[PDB]
Amino acid sequence: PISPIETVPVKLKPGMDGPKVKQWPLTEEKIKALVEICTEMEKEGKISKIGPENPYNTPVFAIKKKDSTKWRKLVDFRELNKRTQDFWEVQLGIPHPAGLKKKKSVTVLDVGDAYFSVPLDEDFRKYTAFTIPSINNETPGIRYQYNVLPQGWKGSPAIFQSSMTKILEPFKKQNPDIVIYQYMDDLYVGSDLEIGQHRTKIEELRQHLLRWGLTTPDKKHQKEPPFLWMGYELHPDKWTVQPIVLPEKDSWTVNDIQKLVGKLNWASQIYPGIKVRQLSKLLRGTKALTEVIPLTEEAELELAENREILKEPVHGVYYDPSKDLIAEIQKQGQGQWTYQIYQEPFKNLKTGKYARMRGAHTNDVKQLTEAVQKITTESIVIWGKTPKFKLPIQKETWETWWTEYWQATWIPEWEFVNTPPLVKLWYQ
Amino acid sequence: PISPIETVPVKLKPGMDGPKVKQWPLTEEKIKALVEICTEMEKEGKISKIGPENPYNTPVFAIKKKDSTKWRKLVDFRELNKRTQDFWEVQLGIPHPAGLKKKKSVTVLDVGDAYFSVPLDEDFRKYTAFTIPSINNETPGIRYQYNVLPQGWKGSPAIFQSSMTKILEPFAAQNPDIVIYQYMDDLYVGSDLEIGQHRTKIEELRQHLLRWGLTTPDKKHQKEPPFLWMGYELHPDKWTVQPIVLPEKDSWTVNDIQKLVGKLNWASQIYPGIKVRQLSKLLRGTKALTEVIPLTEEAELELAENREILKEPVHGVYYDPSKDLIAEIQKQGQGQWTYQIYQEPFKNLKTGKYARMRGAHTNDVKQLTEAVQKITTESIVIWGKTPKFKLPIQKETWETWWTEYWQATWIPEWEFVNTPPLVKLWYQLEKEPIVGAETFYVDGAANRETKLGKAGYVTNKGRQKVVPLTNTTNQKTELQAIYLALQDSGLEVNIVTDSQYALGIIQAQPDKSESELVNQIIEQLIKKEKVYLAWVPAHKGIGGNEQV
Ligand SMILES: N#C/C=C/c1cc(Cl)cc(Oc2ccc(Cl)cc2OCCn2ccc(=O)[nH]c2=O)c1
């Protein structure tokens, strides 16, 4: 296209240099795909080839996009983001609406293509360098840098923000009760309307944006859909910390009461007002594990009192904007996964359970990947920022296979845990 | 001059300046030896005399090589190198021969006077200035500067590789029947073309490069297979390692032990069965690089085995993209694993080994998983796909394991090979408590000062035991309690422990360790029929009987 005006100057936080990050080895397939995509982007002026005097590098991957059958290029900008946008969540920072999480339905739209129109500051381009790797180190990698606002960079929506506001303003006038938040390449549109009316309004925004020159390839099945039901629509009002549940049985055994007392004693770190004394009395000493032990009066009183105290949320739990968000996930087996989003230990901002469908169309890594995406999205809607995950998986395994199942255009931060204890059956 | 090649723009590191080091010194014997070089380099346009205008400067030393007919000029660029900008990193790793495709013909072309054949960015040249002195007496020192890439300069390799890469493109465009790999100052060309027209094409490439100012072998045309390259032997139908030499010594050096394990793990690419475990366990001491380190019986036995395998040479083959890629893993049994990668039964692309040096306690299935992981990564790097696996593990075994495991694990397409020692889990703890089973309440403790402590149990049958321990820790006594309960019980047993640690070890299902206690615990668990391990919080006063 053309530069509508000059380029918005980008200044890194002083005393900090550009990203230098190794490029992971890729499958021949994905390399070929990247070569096609980048050749095309080069013809269109989006990116240019660079010389050895550009020291910087940022990783690149080839994902499958969405259920669409063709490849998509995904750049991992986490490093550059940390090195720029941390100062650009200040200068150009986009405010986060607190009413987005309260809407009955929230649809996510891909607005990324817009960024392709806007040129990037000439001085800043060298930091966007990436490399298409060669197999077996046989040839030197192919090196490009961005000539336009790149997808995945957090400064991209920050620069385009005014434009987005101008384009959206008319739609907000005709629809004052619809909440719209921009996170990177995505637009989150909340509403309280009926599902049908909601989808209608979403299509209205699609046609609006489109006739204003902003493409959003969200076109779903066209005329007649096969198989798969719909797509991405969130319902954030269903997102809250889940209550901890104690097992309920007609009769109890020594071992059952042992597990119960254990779980309660663990829960004491969360809900300090729990009394375990009457509950561990009833087995005084040296009993067989399978011996059935009927409960007394004060025992049942204590159990019920501990049941109704555990069904109501904690105290003093609030979101600290200066503190990072942390997501723990634990594998429950049979396709079920549980997760906690917190900031400081034992104070949970959000907890949930992600469950996919079994029967050998799925494996562990796929489920964990989808779970991470889901949690990240929830986190975006609620707090306007992503959590850092502690993943129950071997680092090299995750690093190898994560790009296969990854539909999202952003990348959350992550680290890996080799430890976790008995806390599995306690969270479900 | 060499101007046709487009220079690469170079900046100094931000907020710096060119090297200001002055040189008066030193010797007059090597001065007129330096002038002889500098005049011929000046005539060749590589360096140019600069004047009074107060440039920067850098130290210059003269030195000789054996067979003194060849003089050597050595300029020290370390300071400038500190002050120059960072460049894109040159190719780090080297291509592995197992990933090369067999070609009907292969040619090697080295370019001489490489760096001096690539111009240096003009504005930067002033920072490369250097001085040849004389002895006092109103004589201004001779000032030069580089018009081309200075030998030893920081940006020289990357800019050179960039330049070569560019020069190659107007050629490779007209000839994609021929494939050119680039490494440092070397070009490795190959083709399936008929030998005559292959030779013709090679000469065409030569004249191209020569027109761009890049020299290349004329006398001969040099290397014919092998092809001893980067510690390899490259033969037309096969590849192997450059011959391995294991020294024999009465006294072994930690340095020499590093060189030893180095030569061995290098040898592991092709020769199957190489074991580095004991020899590396020798090196586990990180202290004293000159320390004389004795051997062990296991270590010397291991080295002997390695010598025995190394005795008879085996060769690797090259890669055929039309044929499937297969990886096969076998367990060596000491915590060491071996694998071969092949598309063919009697021919290996390569081999390799994986050992778990992390921590202590880990089981066979998890280790196998990690091995599959390392192989998958290596195969992605060398080839660009992932192999089909042949694994010595039953389907139901791995299924049970991954379904029971707290971590998400993934293995690609694989099939069971019946070659023992097949990987299995020797014991599975009960999911629910056992009826008609003696219930052992176990505990253990220790004084972290005196380091004595005790371990014991009390059962529901009124049976109690207390065994004194010496030189132990709370963890040791706590495992000792469970072990004690295992010894004194029947084929079906319910154990209750207060410690998360011991339960953690037991639930982890390890089949081996360097801890003999855990080993005997394992043996007990195998000898048992049904074992149910259960956990309760300590000092909560429930079923536990503790002491202090
Ligand atoms: N010094 C040095 C060389 C080093 C060197 C290093 C590398 Cl990475 C490759 C190389 O030669 C090759 C160059 C290009 C291709 Cl496509 C295959 C090659 O196969 C080599 C194997 N080979 C060798 C001979 C032959 O006839 N057929 C054959 O397939 C040479």
Per the annotation, binding residues of B for Mg(2+) are 110, 185-186, 443, 478, 498
Q: Which residues of A touch B532 (CB under 8 A)?
A: 289
Looking at the DSSP assignment, which residues form a beta bridge with residue A138? none
Q: Which residue of B has its CA nearest to A332?
A: B406
Q: Is B436 exposed, middle or buried (0-12, 13-18, 19+ CB in 10 A)?
A: exposed
Strands A348-355 and A388-391: unpaired
Looking at the DSSP assignment, which residues form a beta bridge with residue B20? B57
CA distance B537 to A262: 6
Q: How is residue A75 written in tokens?
A: 């750049």
Buried b (16+ CB within 10 A) or exposed e, B121-139: beebbebbbbbbbeeeeee
State the method: X-ray
Q: Which residues of A touch B433 (CB under 8 A)?
A: 253, 255, 289-290
Chain-centroid distance, C-alpha B377:
12
Residue from B191, B234, B235, B317 to probe ligand 1 pocket by mutation (most atoms less than 8 Å from CB)? B234
Q: What do you get for the CA distance between the two ends of chain B, in Å?
A: 89
Q: Give B192's contacts (C-beta < 8 A, 6+ positions apart).
A: B103, B104, B105, B177
CA distance A394 to B407: 8
Buried b (16+ CB within 10 A) or exposed e, B390-418: bbbbeeebbeebbeebbbbbbbeebebee
CA distance A382 to B148: 59
Contact between chains at A286 and B93 (C-beta distance less than 8 A): no
Q: Which structural domains are found in chain A, ordered by start? A: 9-98+124-164 (3.10.10.10), 99-123+165-233 (3.30.70.270), 234-319 (3.30.70.270), 320-428 (3.30.70.270)
Among B472, B367, B464, B355, which Cα is nearest to B411's?
B367
Q: In chain B, what's the furthest Cα-to-Cα distance? A: 109
Centre a 10 Å sphere on the Cβ of residue A101 and count the other Cβ atoms it contains. Answer: 20
CA distance B105 to B68: 39
Q: How is residue B184 written in tokens?
A: 């440092």
Q: How is residue A387 written in tokens?
A: 């959590």
Question: Which residues line the pocket of ligand 1, CB cutoff 6 A?
Answer: B 95, 100-103, 105-106, 108, 179, 181, 188, 190, 223, 225, 227, 229, 234, 236, 318
Contact between chains at A26 and B384 (C-beta distance less than 8 A): yes
CA distance B491 to B486: 9
CA distance B543 to A285: 5
DSSP states of B302-360: HHHHHHHHHHS---B--B-TTS--EEEEEE-SSSEEEEEEESSSS-BSEEEEEE--SSS
Atom of ligand 1 nearest to the CA of A136: 8
Q: Which residues of A touch B370 (CB under 8 A)?
A: 394
Residue from B103, B205, B315, B349 to probe ligand 1 pocket by mutation (most atoms less than 8 Å from CB)? B103
A146 Cα to chain B: minimum distance (Å): 17
A403 φ, ψ (degrees, to nearest 5):
-75, -15
Specify the residue for token string 């930067």: B124
Q: Give A386's contacts (C-beta < 8 A, 6+ positions apart).
A: A325, A376, A379, A380, A410, A412, A413
Among B454, B459, B455, which Cα is nearest to B440's?
B459
CA atoms within 13 A on the CB side of B399: 6
Sheet holding A233-234, edge to edge: A179-183, A186-191, A105-110, A233-234
Q: B410, B440, B495: best mutation site toward chain A, by most A Cβ within 10 Å?
A: B410
Q: Which of residues 152-191 of B touch A (CB under 8 A)?
A: 155, 158-159, 161-162, 165, 181-182
Determine what percent of chain A falls in helix, strand and coil, rounding each to the nearest 5: 30, 20, 50
Q: Whose CA is nearest to atom 30 of ligand 1?
A: B188
Spatial contact of B338 and B329, defined as CB atoms under 8 Å apart: yes
- What class is the B1-90+116-156 domain? alpha beta
Spatial contact of B401 and B425, defined as CB atoms under 8 Å apart: yes
Centre a 10 Å sphere on the Cβ of residue B17 and count the other Cβ atoms it contains. Answer: 10
> Is B145 in CB contact (< 8 Å) with chain A?
no
Spatial contact of B474 and B453, defined as CB atoms under 8 Å apart: yes
Which own/partner pairs from B206-209 qualify as long-range (CB within 8 Å, at least 24 positions apart)? B206/B109, B208/B167, B208/B170, B208/B171, B209/B109, B209/B111, B209/B167
Q: B406, B432, B459: best mutation site toward chain A, by most A Cβ within 10 Å?
A: B406
Q: Please say whether the dihedral angle defined by the alpha carbons of residues A135, A136, A139 and A145, taken in this order, is positive or negative.
A: positive
Chain-centroid distance, C-alpha A129:
25
- Resolution of the experimentally solved model in angstroms: 2.8
Listed by start position, the domains of chain B span: 1-90+116-156, 91-115+157-225, 226-319, 320-426, 427-548
Q: Please say whether the dihedral angle defined by the alpha carbons of residues A234, A235, A239 and A243, taken in this order, is positive or negative.
A: negative
Q: Which CATH number is correct for B427-548, 3.60.15.10, 3.30.420.40, 3.30.420.10, 3.40.50.2300? A: 3.30.420.10
Q: Give A22's contacts (C-beta < 8 A, 6+ positions apart).
A: A57, A59
Contact between chains at B535 and A262 (C-beta distance less than 8 A): yes
Centre a 10 Å sphere on the Cβ of residue B488 and count the other Cβ atoms it contains. Answer: 14
CATH number, span B226-319? 3.30.70.270
DSSP H/E element including B388: strand B388-391
Contact between chains at A52 and B439 (C-beta distance less than 8 A): no
Contact between chains at B87 and A422 (C-beta distance less than 8 A): no
Looking at the DSSP assignment, which residues form a beta bridge with residue B60? B75
Would you give the DSSP letter of residue A128? Answer: G
CA of residue B227 to ligand 1 center, whole Å? 8
The reply to whether domains B1-90+116-156 and B427-548 share a CATH topology is no
Spatial contact of B423 and B393, defined as CB atoms under 8 Å apart: yes
Spatial contact of A60 and A34, defined as CB atoms under 8 Å apart: yes
CATH number, span B320-426? 3.30.70.270
> Is B492 in CB contact (< 8 Å) with chain A?
no
User: Measured between alpha carbons, how far is residue A334 from residues A356, A363, A393, A416, B222 in Å?
Assistant: 9, 10, 17, 22, 64
Q: How is residue B416 written in tokens?
A: 């069971």
Torsion angle of C-alpha atoms A46, A52, A53, A55, degrees rounded to 10: 80
Residue from B182, B183, B186, B188 to probe ligand 1 pocket by mutation (most atoms less than 8 Å from CB)? B188
Q: Is A364 annotated as a binding residue?
A: no
Q: A53, A58, A254: best mutation site toward chain B, by most B Cβ within 10 Å?
A: A53
Among B475, B476, B470, B495, which Cα is nearest to B485's?
B495
Torsion angle of C-alpha atoms B336, B340, B345, B349, degrees rounded to 10: -160
Would you give the DSSP letter of residue B509? Answer: -
- What class is the B91-115+157-225 domain? alpha beta
CA of residue B193 to ligand 1 center, whole Å? 14
Determine the length of chain A: 428
Q: How is residue B332 written in tokens?
A: 């060596």
> Is B402 in CB contact (< 8 Å) with chain A?
yes
